[PDB]
Amino acid sequence: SYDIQAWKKQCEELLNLIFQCEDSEPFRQPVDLLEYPDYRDIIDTPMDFATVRETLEAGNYESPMELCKDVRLIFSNSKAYTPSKRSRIYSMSLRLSAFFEEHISSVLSDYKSALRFHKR
Numbered sequence: 001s002y003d004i005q006a007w008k009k010q011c012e013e014l015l016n017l018i019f020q021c022e023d024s025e026p027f028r029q030p031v032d033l034l035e036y037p038d039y040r041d042i043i044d045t046p047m048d049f050a051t052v053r054e055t056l057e058a059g060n061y062e063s064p065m066e067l068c069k070d071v072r073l074i075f076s077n078s079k080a081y082t083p084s085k086r087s088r089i090y091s092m093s094l095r096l097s098a099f100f101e102e103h104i105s106s107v108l109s110d111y112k113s114a115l116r117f118h119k120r
């Protein structure tokens, strides 16, 4: 698999699977700043899966590493905002992070292998 462009559709498919996960519910759209009035005191850079999908479709990611950084920001924001590790939304974030990491590893490996083959 030395296709330099294959990661994009692989990331679209993975986002589709994350949207089917019930555990993505709290992360499908920008955080509700009315409900969580302190949110932007705690979180410098909001991120959500709809923003990640729109950035991908706009052609504004150059690599799957950049997409992976934004998805990891969704999860670090949830860990920063949680009042406890025994919270529903943080708990959903941890299962969804495990699912994401399990699926993104081959996407990153294949991309990096394709770049190395291009420069051979």
Ligand SMILES: O=C(Nc1ccccn1)N1CCN(C(=O)c2ccco2)CC1
Pocket (backbone or CB within 6 Å): 025, 026, 027, 029, 030, 031, 032, 035, 036, 077, 078, 079, 081, 082, 083, 087, 089, 090
């Ligand atoms: O308001 C939303 N998301 C939303 C927006 C509109 C409809 C449904 N859900 N949050 C709450 C903050 N959040 C956290 O990570 C967190 C950790 C502990 C408590 O909340 C997830 C995102």
